[PDB]
Structure formats: structure tokens, C-alpha cells
Amino acid sequence: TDNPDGIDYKTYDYVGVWGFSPLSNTNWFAAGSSTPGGITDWTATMNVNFDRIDNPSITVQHPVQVQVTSYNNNSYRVRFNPDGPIRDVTRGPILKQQLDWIRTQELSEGCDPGMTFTSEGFLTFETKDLSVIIYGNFKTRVTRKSDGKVIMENDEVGTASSGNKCRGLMFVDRLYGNAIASVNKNFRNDAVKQEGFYGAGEVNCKYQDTYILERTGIAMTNYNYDNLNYNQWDLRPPHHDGALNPDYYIPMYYAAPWLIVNGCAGTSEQYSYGWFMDNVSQSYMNTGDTTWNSGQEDLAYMGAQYGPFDQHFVYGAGGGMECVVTAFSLLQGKEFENQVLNKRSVMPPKYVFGFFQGVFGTSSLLRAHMPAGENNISVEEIVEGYQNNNFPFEGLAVDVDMQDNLRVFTTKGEFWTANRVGTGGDPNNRSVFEWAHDKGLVCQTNITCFLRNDNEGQDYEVNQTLRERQLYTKNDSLTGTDFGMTDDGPSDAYIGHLDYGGGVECDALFPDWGRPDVAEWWGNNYKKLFSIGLDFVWQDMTVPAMMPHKIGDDINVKPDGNWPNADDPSNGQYNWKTYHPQVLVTDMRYENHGREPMVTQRNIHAYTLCESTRKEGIVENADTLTKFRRSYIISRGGYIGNQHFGGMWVGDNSTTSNYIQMMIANNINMNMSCLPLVGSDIGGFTSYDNENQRTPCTGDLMVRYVQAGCLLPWFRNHYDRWIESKDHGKDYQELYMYPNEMDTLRKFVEFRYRWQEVLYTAMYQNAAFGKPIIKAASMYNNDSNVRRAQNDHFLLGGHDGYRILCAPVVWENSTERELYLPVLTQWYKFGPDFDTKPLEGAMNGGDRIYNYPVPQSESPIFVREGAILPTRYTLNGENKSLNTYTDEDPLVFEVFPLGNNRADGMCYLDDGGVTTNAEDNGKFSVVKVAAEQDGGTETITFTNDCYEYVFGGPFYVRVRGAQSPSNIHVSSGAGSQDMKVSSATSRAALFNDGENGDFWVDQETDSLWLKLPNVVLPDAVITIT
């Protein structure tokens, strides 16, 4: 059943943005003419005549479907398949079942797009806010009803005398290629529109010496790659001389063929729309880049090395770019499964939002069992460092260090307290994971999908059962290529090589995911780790990232680093640091469809692995999860839709200012690509000192890395540690190792911890509504200076999610940055210090301050007026891990000074992942709160949208700017009472000794604190006179 559509696969190698050239026309079909082919449901068919642009008399016919995906969220989809019948994918971000659910709802509401073929054969339809017309050759014009603004149009190219052809639909003549593309007009250069292009997952873009957010006027590709430092030498453009910097034309680890167009920014006539080309082969996004003649200033396009053509234009229901993100998340939603919680992404345990230390280069659990070696460290020393120094510290990322000879799902004795491997639950021989629980910590460990093959006759159950059950990727191809062999066998398996550097290496078999049976087998392996105490998963080398390898060479030999290149091309011999792209993998996109070569689907492999880990690993074997039944995944690779599996970190960065800059950019961009739980290793993973690789990250840079990283969804210090037996990396990188800075390091980790409910509530907003956690500055509306500030200003938190403004310093040795504060709202300077002193004066929005002061000990962070922020504290005043908090650790609603006499706030509550009942059975609570000021009366009102989780402890209201009241009355379903002044005179005394119904007048910080019983949380009216 192999290659059932009978494709000739013409291209196998990587093809850079310099080798992708739609606008060249030659050898390309474009849409020339059409006739109507009927409408069923919301899907119209046009029978399109494609004409060779360079020889229009050469013509083919393929049916093209136009589908209104959502009326209310203003979205439609265009799809065809030049190579076979049009097929629904069985796996991927956009499934038919969910499209079907959306339409079913909207139909039941009386939504009617009114899709019609005119008598001229023109296709027209409407959405809530938009009207669309497609002419005979596919020329498409999308107009906004309110003002009649044309907000999108596709591209036509002229011919001599054969008429205009629409390059909105393009495919290369299958005689010469397999490629596809689609071209729009691009108003980047319009004096009024000034179209901007945002999104694109992980792409890095340099402008001068600074890394920037926007993705306008550049040629990008999606080509999941083992891209260490984001600049792998083999990724260089042809004939490139000198240092290759990370930059826009280099693929990353995430595959996001997705862009948000945004025009007329900061005006009432603003428009935004997303553009998704659902394709998992190498794909491309060009936003008007003339470099290599890849594009034209006034044209934007997307395309891909292989078919089929499936594309989505997503305008959203409301004004602003965020509405585009939510609508997109809607389209990939799980409402069709009746998810009570995980609608648009999956909720993590609370513990995911804590501060995690990873290290590549640990050698034991305990100091007493650490093998002697230069600069060797034990897991124990790391925990002591953080705990003895009172760091809020969550746990560890344990690396391949703990495995038995790189065998995934194993451990070796050095990583047990008794120095031998046990089966778990033995109190006189604890694994690293068990010992870590007893420290109040949780752990992620490193899982790759390489199953060690060279075992020297020694038994390794995972590889054996992979072999025995024939679940591995075979070594078959259509090209008759020799992928290689070893003495281990099997005679018919793909065999790759894992290389960590420094002799840390092995042969590996791999799972052929598209096979039915593979996913069940994979997920079950995790039992071996969950049962010895493992809490969550850190997914690595997911490409799958293999050692560079040229066909012909022995399996363990890499090619010269300079190869391949322009003068010495791969010519289908380079493996491209993954599977040799010729290999026949069982179809991941279509179940029951045979095998295609991996070139067709490279960017789905990671998504598929995370999927299998999620469904068959974290979910189906939840029984064996020890301390928390909810688990999470942090992946290195993936594809749009990964959020229903977990989050991401941006693989191997490094320790320079630029990588701070890139980390902010990535985090913002990845968020608006609907992957919100993301971060980059804090301190950079790799060595950065060219003279001596072991020099550790400086104190100032770490401070800034930390200040920048501290509110981003995923906060981990991880690094390559130099050790005798793995002689690459730095000496150390842990926050406790910085005496001069410790007091600044510690407080920002504290600050984070205090806003643990701000982060977790945003995560709720994402799971339920798809709001991204981190907002690009351009998502703030009706402001025409945010575009300029968007590189390093990002928003988060609160009821709407624009309550906190961050503007980290992004340069080592700098005590200033230019600061922009969004217009028509007031800001309050805040940070780690302000919890224990009064707020300063309000700052006006729309102020640009050049050279705004930021000492090393500070970071620019502002809370907006009208914010009420849930805030946590330990009862005993010591710093502890998120995971060992209980409801007797105070929950405090901090009410900031009011905006237009009001403030609002929201808080999500569940058992934090202890069980999965919030997401299986609806066991969570959504508290809302509001403050209003009338004359001399202030009313603070608690309501709920559901209260199915009982907050088992007292809670507080902290009114900023309020002092002593004449009276406070509390009215609630149960306790209607007047409050009294506590006999407590300090905050620690009010927490521990204060009675429910006590208030405290806090002069030192100009706050009024109210202590309230747990039972009045879900519904209450507080009137202060």
C-alpha cells in the first residue's frame, strides 16, 4: 500500500529560502479559470483550470474547496490536492470533527454565510463582519462590512495575451516538482496601512545589533532542525563566509507556518488576520523579501516542498491581534470532545510555574556516591545550594546523566540513595525522584525517542520489544538508498546515531509512529519512571535529532563540518541531522494510508511524539503517577497544535545579551502561534566564551536573564556543565553560585512565586478561551507607539490580561532603557521591592521616557490601574516550592489604585494537579472580584462562575491607597457581619494569629488588609466607609 497516490518525489534535501522562488513563475501552474462545482454544507467547490504561467496553453483541472470554517469568528479555508483526491487529516491541529462541531453550533444559532455561486460563476459568501468574493480565476477580495475596507487580496500575474493568472493557488508542474505556494498582495509599503507581519513560532530576526519581534520583509522556512545556538553551520546560505549568526532565514525547532497580518495599527480602522498554511513538509513564509530574489517587496507568500494545499484565513471576532490568536485556537479546539477545562490547550500542574534547575553533567544523586571527577556535581549539592540559601525552588530537570548508558527509561545505581537500582517505594533506597519528593521538590527527566541499539549483548527491554513487535522505522526507500547497517541488526531497520559530544554516543532504532500499536507501546514505557517517582516529562531531540551523516559512511562517522555546501552540495546524501529524508515512514498524517518518505512530513514527527506521550503516557498511565496525577510535557520540537500536549522550551540557546533578546521575542511569538507554555534556558545553555569555554555566565547577565525570564510561562535555569567525562560546557550556572547578586536573584524568584496565581489564572484563560499568556505590545489597541516598543515590551496578567507591563533591560552592563507606557491608562511602578513599601505616584500612559533608570537590582515592571491581582504567601515566611503550598498559605487579592473608580480581578482555583479532577470532572473554581468607589463608599464584590473547588483556608483583600476605615461591612450567603480592627500589628501576626473578620491598617505600605473566612470567597459584598 506504499505511495498509494503514486507521487514522483523530486526533492529530498533541505531547500533554503534562497532556493524557493514562486514569483519566478517558470515551471509553475497558477489558477487561470474555473466553473462552479456545487456547494454542500459550508464547502463550495470550484473546478479550477490551472495554467502554466510560462506556457498558458499547458493546463490541468483540479477541484478546489472553499470552506467557511466559522461565521462568528470570521474564518474560511481553501484546499486542494494537485496529486490525488482531497483528504481529511486524521492527526494535526485542525480536525474535521472540530470544524464540524463549530459549524453545527453556528448553524443552530442561525448563522448563514449565504455561500452562493453567482450566475457569472463567481463564488460569494459572508461572515459576521466580512464579505468575500472569488472571481473565475480565483482572484479573491475580502471586504470588511462596517467600512467597506478591502483588508485582504490575493495575487494575479499577467501573461502576454492569455489573461491574468491567480497565484493565490500555485503548484509546480509534477513533471519538475512537488512544490506548492499561495500569494497575496502585501501592503507593507502603503503609507497608511503599513502592514506588519507577526508570528512564525521561533524564528529569530536581527536588525543591526538588536533582535526584534516583527517578521515583515523576510524569507522564513519551517524545517525542524537540531539547531544548537540557532546558527548551525550547515544551515548557512550558499557561499556564506565568516560567522553565521542566528537570523531570519534559519529554521528552528518549532514549525509554525502561521502569520498575523496587522494594518492601520493604532487607529479605529485597524484590521488583523492570521494566515495558516497547514502543511508539515518543509514550508515557507516570505513577507516581501527581495534577498536572493526570493520575494517582492509588495507580495507576501507561503508555500511548501510538498502537497496537499490546505490553508486558513482567520480574522477573529473582535478588534486587535489577540482576537486572531483566540479564533485560531478555537479552530484547533477540543469542544467536540466536550472538554470541561482543556478546550484550547491542556492545563499543567501548578508546579510547572515554579523555578527549575537543570544541569547536563550531574553524576550522582548524593555526594556520598559521586564518582571522583574534575568539577563533578551531585544532585544533592544542587538542592542544598538552593535550599540553604532560601531560594524559592521547585525541583530539577534530570538529564540523560541518570540513564544506564543512554538507554531511555532506565536509571543507574548512582542516582539512588543506596547506589543500586530498585523498583520504587523502598524507604531505604530512594531514587532521585523519590528523594526529591522528600525535599518538597518535583522533577522532569529527559526522554528522547532514540532506543539504544548497540548494547553489547546486554539486555535492554525497550529495544528488544521494539524489535520483537516490529515497531521501528524500517530502512526502505523508493530511491534504493543505503542508510547503513551495524552488527546489532535488525537487517531491515533504520539505524541512526546519537552524539552528545565528547564520546557520549550510541546507535539507535526509532519508533515508526504512524503504525497502529506504536503509540500504546511508547506510552507504556513511562510506567518504568512514573512508578519510581517521576512527575513530568522533558521531551528532547524530537526532530528526531540525529548525528550528521552522509550516505556511504559508517553509521558512527559524521561528515566534515563544512559539508555540505554550495560547491559541494548534499545531492541527496546528507541526512540533514535527522532521518535520511528518503526513508519510508508509516504515514503520520493519514492513518491507514501506507508509507511516504519522511520529506513529506518532517515537521509533524515531534508533534506526533508529544501526542503519544500525552495520550498513552501521561494520561492512560496516570494511575502510576505517584504524588501528582496531572503531569505535563516540555518539548523541544513540535508543530502548530502542540499546546494540547504541553509546552516548549527553545532548545539550546547561549549566554549573551542577544539570546536574552531572542528569548523575549520567541516567547511573545510562540504565544501568538497558540503555544503559550514556553521559555528559554535561563542563563543560556551553551558556553559563550571563545577563549575559555568553561567561563560561567556573568553576574550582571544572569541578573538580567533572570529579570527577563521571571514572568515568562516557563522558568528554568539549564546548562551544559563542563565535567571530566564530558569536557564541554561551563563550570557552574546556579543562582546560589552568585554571591554578589544572590539577594537580587532570590527576590525576583520570590516575586514570580507571589504572582503564581497570576500565571496560573492566565494559563486558565488559555485553556478555556485561548487567550495567549504573554501579549505582544501591538495587541494593546488604539495605541500608535506600541509598534516601536514591541521588541522588548510585553503584557500579561489580570482579568483581561493586560494588567502587567514588562520592559526588561536586554543588554549586559546597562542601567537604562527607553520606556514606553501604553496610552489612556495609568501605570504603577512595581517589582520585588514594592510588596513591602508603598506604591509611588501614577505614571501617565503614552509617555516615552528615554534613558529610563534600571539599576542592576531592578527591572521595569508596571501594574496597571484597576488591577486586582491574586497573590500568594507562605504562612511561615520562608520560601518553599509551589508544589508544597496549601490553602493555609494565604491567598491575597491585591487591589491596586482604581481605574475610573473601578478595579477588576479573576482567580482560577483547583487542587493544583494533585488529581486530574478539574479536567475530567470539572473540579475547579473561577472567582471574580470587583471594586467600585461611590462618594465615601467602596464596594468590593466576590462572585463566581463555578465554585467546585473549595478553597480550604482564609483569604485576604489588600486595598492599596486605603488606610483606616470608619466601618467595614461584609455580606455573604453565610456570614453577614461587621469587621473589627485586628489586635495584630504586623503582617506575619495578622496571618498567623489574626482572626477571621479582622482588618489591619498597614502604614509601612499604605495598605488596608482584610482577613476573611474561606466560606465567603465564592460570594460576598464588602462595603467600606
Ligand SMILES: *[C@@H]1O[C@](F)(CO)[C@@H](O)[C@H](O)[C@H]1O
Ligand atoms: C537535549 O540534549 C541535552 F543537551 C542533553 O540531554 C539537554 O541538556 C538539552 O537541554 C536538550 O537540547
